[PDB]
Write a protein that binds this DNA or RNA. Structure first.
Ligand SMILES: [Mg+2]
Ligand SMILES: [Mg+2]
Ligand SMILES: [Mg+2]
Ligand SMILES: [Mg+2]
Ligand SMILES: [Mg+2]
Ligand SMILES: [Mg+2]
Ligand SMILES: [Mg+2]
Ligand SMILES: [Mg+2]
Ligand SMILES: [Mg+2]
Ligand SMILES: [Mg+2]
Ligand SMILES: [Mg+2]
Ligand SMILES: [Mg+2]
Ligand SMILES: [Mg+2]
Ligand SMILES: [Mg+2]
Ligand SMILES: [Mg+2]
Ligand SMILES: [Mg+2]
Ligand SMILES: [Mg+2]
Ligand SMILES: [Mg+2]
Lengths: 117, 234, 68, 252
RNA sequence: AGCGCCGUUCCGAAGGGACGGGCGAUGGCCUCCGUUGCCCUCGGCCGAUCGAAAGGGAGUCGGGUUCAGAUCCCCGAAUC
RNA sequence: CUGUUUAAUUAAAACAAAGCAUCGCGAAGGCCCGCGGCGGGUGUUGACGCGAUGUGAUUUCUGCCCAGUGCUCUGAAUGU
RNA sequence: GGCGAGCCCGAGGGGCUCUCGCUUCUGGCGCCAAGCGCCCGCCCGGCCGGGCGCGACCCGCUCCGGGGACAGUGCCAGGU
């Protein structure tokens, strides 16, 4: 060893990967936010209803924890229809209002008739 | 052979850059490094008292190796061989139904309390004292005490080197009280040279003040001024 | 057997053998930090008569305070 | 009473130096192998106006003999250098304007500026605009040297410390009257909050030890000793004389 | 004494990164790629982090649309 | 002179102000803050500077007093 | 170390005593070693691929300087 630099620093030493002897919360904390708990309501106001005919677009009320990718997955995994894109806003009462544009193949009127509204 | 020129560099001041030199003496060491180095230099600068300058005056390497060849075979039993002697002695006494098959084990005592008791009651033949005891108050009574009680003592370098014969890290002291048949002449041969070194020269050693050694730069400066004094006189 | 000699050598602490060790240790402890962990006591008997039995779990701190 | 105007400077709430727009502290090279055993070349890149400083500030670039890299330092611009003049610094460096070199090389009568008190603190003495120290009376053994400071103090210093040769550029700066309040306002707005100095006579008795009373008069002797505590040292501070001057100063 | 205070480089072993090379291991189409461990070489940090809905900061504009939106919805054309 | 002030009674002859002087200090320093550490501020500064006062453009002038009261220098000079 | 000058004896030589040295017209460029010399797997006396020392002197107890048993800090005492 011929120590060139005037500064003396630490040697890069060995740091162990953590390998515990027991799990520390007994279980995976289960996902409370699954697909039936993401999407609360469909919405039957007249302004939201007008978008169904005129824009091929559905309106839902979502809990505020869920983001746009999870809404885009949940609408597919419940209603078996594609998602063009998703706009969201926070409705000033407190919930999240999510507009979901469907694919051009599908029909918002048929999906409204088959979810009941 | 065709092109293959020499391209020398010139490492003068004000031109082509310096290469990487050794830089051992100039690296900014951390705190504990500088502490132990200034600790050694502070021992060398100050006037150490004669009770503790006795250490750094110790037994040489050849006689230390001969003493260790003596003490290597008086090894106290560590856990495996103590377990072996206990279980095997219990098995043989349970088989042969004997009372006292164990004749005499001669073994060396260690530890400062176990040494000092034997030196007070005059059982010790030879006291081995380690050099490197960092609280020196743990030792500094022992040379004058062994001097009064007549037991010869030898200062040997390396307190870890006493640990490898006692199956432990630090040992600080080794007592010799009891010898075998063959080892008596070797032990007396050791005790003669040890009494020549330590005990009979105790009144000599007790008045030496060790250390008081100035820094070599300052010693070189005073010696250069002494040559200047020689230039003034002659 | 020997802790009596330890205690008596530490007892008359103004003599010339001990005050050198005391001065070296004062410089040594001043150059370090304010609170740290010594691996082993520097007064073994005096720490032992306060309850230090050298086994697994008895820690020795060295600590520094300002006078006045 | 209330705290006087003098004691608020120690707080540093609104009396710090307005230190944003400044470029850097004007230091010499930290002394190393080359400046003690030879000389090393340097280019001045430019000079700039260091704000709050009357001296112009030169930006001299150096070559670093250890790492393949150019280093940039900030010297006080000696009078008469210009962008493209080489600056030579080191022990045996030749003596011209701008060449910072130790005082042991220069003969007595040399007129320098921007020197070190103790060898290796990168310039303390004689740094203001238009000033110079003067080097006299070398002792060969026990390397010390007398210098005249711009006040008149004759100081003995070590001979291993370094100084740039010439005068600090920007002399004659006090030759123009500021002549209106606004330019003084811009000057002290560049430096620090110390303008509108109220006459400790004019201010009120809980605010200064002088003022108050029906007339604007002090009423106390205006020379106050140095053993006097804080808040008291107003007016003349331990004046060994007063009145209008006479002689030169003649203080030994 | 103390909740703590001072302090922002000062009295600190304050980088867990990469280039190639070598030894070794694992896995995929074990062709050959992809990981991981060790070692060598290199690497000023003028210091964590915070601080601007007017400073710095890549990239969207036009037409139409509602009882309430608009450079966001639609139509069409672009760009990072 | 321009400027500023007692917001909720004063706008001035007051205040500052450039100019004129005066004093401390060569960094182990001055003048300050701080309960504390050689902790801060002036200072990323160094006598054409920092700090503390007086007077108040220019023009012409700055007389006389060290008794009092301060301030300062000096010497174990010699009383306390 | 003489490309050196010295101050001597001196036929060369001695080191008596040393001085330090490889950049001063110019807004350039400079790193990650050329060369040397040993050792390996590699081709019948050869070819390819690696390593180590000299280049860059050795030893030594503080990083280098400047102060220093003072200044400073703790307590006590007297002036202010
Ligand atoms: Mg332990
Ligand atoms: Mg004024
Ligand atoms: Mg005024
Ligand atoms: Mg008033
Ligand atoms: Mg008052
Ligand atoms: Mg009157
Ligand atoms: Mg931010
Ligand atoms: Mg903005
Ligand atoms: Mg439009
Ligand atoms: Mg609107
Ligand atoms: Mg105001
Ligand atoms: Mg009014
Ligand atoms: Mg200061
Ligand atoms: Mg006038
Ligand atoms: Mg008068
Ligand atoms: Mg008098
Ligand atoms: Mg020193
Ligand atoms: Mg001295």
């Amino acid at each position: 060893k011929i120590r060139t630099s005037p500064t003396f620093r630490r040697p890069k030493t060995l740091r162990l990967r953590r390998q515990p002897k027991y799990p520390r919360k007994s279980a995976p904390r289960r996902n409370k936010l699954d697909h039936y708990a993401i999407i609360k309501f469909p919405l039957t106001t007249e302004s939201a209803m007008k978008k169904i005919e005129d824009n091929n677009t559905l309106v839902f009320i979502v809990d505020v924890k869920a983001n746009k990718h999870q809404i885009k997955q949940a609408v597919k995994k419940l209603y078996d229809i594609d998602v063009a894109k998703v706009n969201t806003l926070i409705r000033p009462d407190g919930e999240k209002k999510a507009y979901v544009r469907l694919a051009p193949d599908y029909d918002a009127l048929d999906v409204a008739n088959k979810i009941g509204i | 052979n065709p092109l293959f020129e020499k391209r020398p560099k010139n490492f003068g001041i004000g031109q082509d850059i310096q290469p990487k030199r050794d830089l051992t003496r100039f690296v900014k060491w951390p705190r504990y490094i500088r502490l132990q180095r200034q600790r050694a230099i502070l021992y060398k600068r100050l006037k150490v008292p004669p009770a503790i300058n006795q250490f750094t005056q110790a037994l040489d390497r050849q006689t230390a190796t001969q003493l260790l060849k003596l003490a290597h075979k008086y090894r106290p039993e560590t856990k495996q061989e103590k377990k072996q002697r206990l279980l095997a002695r219990a098995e043989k006494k349970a088989a042969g139904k004997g009372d006292v098959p164990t004749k005499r084990p001669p073994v060396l005592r260690a530890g400062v309390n176990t040494v000092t008791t034997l030196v007070e009651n005059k059982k010790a033949q030879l006291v081995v004292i380690a050099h490197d005891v960092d609280p020196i108050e743990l030792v500094v009574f022992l040379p004058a005490l062994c001097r009064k009680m007549g037991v010869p003592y030898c200062i040997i370098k390396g307190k870890a080197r006493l640990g490898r014969l006692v199956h432990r890290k630090t040992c600080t002291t080794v007592a010799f009280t009891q010898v075998n048949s063959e080892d008596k002449g070797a032990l007396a041969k050791l005790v003669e040279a040890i009494r020549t070194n330590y005990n009979d020269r105790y009144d000599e050693i007790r008045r030496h003040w060790g250390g008081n050694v100035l820094g070599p730069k300052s010693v070189a400066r005073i010696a250069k001024l002494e040559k200047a004094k020689a230039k003034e006189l002659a | 057997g020997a802790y009596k000699y330890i205690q008596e050598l530490w007892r008359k602490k103004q003599s010339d053998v001990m005050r050198f060790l005391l001065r070296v240790r004062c410089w040594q402890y001043r150059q370090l930090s304010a609170l740290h962990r010594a691996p082993r006591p520097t007064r073994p008997d005096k720490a032992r008569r306060l309850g230090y039995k050298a086994k697994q779990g008895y820690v020795i701190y060295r600590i520094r305070v300002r006078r006045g | 009473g209330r705290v006087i105007r003098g004691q608020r400077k120690g707080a540093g709430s609104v009396f710090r130096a307005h230190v944003k727009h400044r470029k850097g502290a004007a230091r010499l090279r930290a002394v190393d192998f080359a400046e003690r055993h030879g000389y090393i070349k340097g280019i001045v890149k430019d000079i700039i106006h260091d704000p709050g400083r009357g001296a112009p500030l030169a930006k001299v670039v150096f070559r670093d003999p250890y790492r393949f890299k150019k280093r940039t330092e900030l010297f006080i611009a000696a009078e008469g250098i210009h962008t493209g003049q080489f600056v030579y610094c080191g022990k045996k460096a030749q003596l011209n304007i701008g060449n910072v070199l130790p005082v042991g090389t220069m003969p007595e009568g040399t007129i320098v500026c921007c020197l070190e008190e103790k060898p290796g603190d990168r310039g303390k003495l004689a740094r203001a605009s238009g000033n110079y120290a003067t080097v006299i009376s070398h002792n060969p053994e026990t390397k010390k040297t007398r210098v005249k400071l711009p006040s008149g103090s004759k100081k003995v210093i070590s001979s291993a410390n370094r100084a740039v040769v010439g005068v600090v550029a920007g002399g004659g700066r006090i030759d123009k009257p500021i002549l209106k309040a606004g330019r003084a306002y811009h000057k002290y707005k560049a430096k620090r909050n110390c303008w509108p100095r109220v006459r400790g006579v004019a201010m009120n008795p809980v605010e200064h030890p002088f003022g108050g009373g029906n007339h604007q008069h002090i009423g106390k002797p205006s020379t106050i000793r140095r053993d006097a505590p804080a808040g008291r040292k107003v007016g003349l501070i331990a004046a060994r004389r007063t009145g209008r001057l006479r002689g030169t100063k003649t203080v030994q």
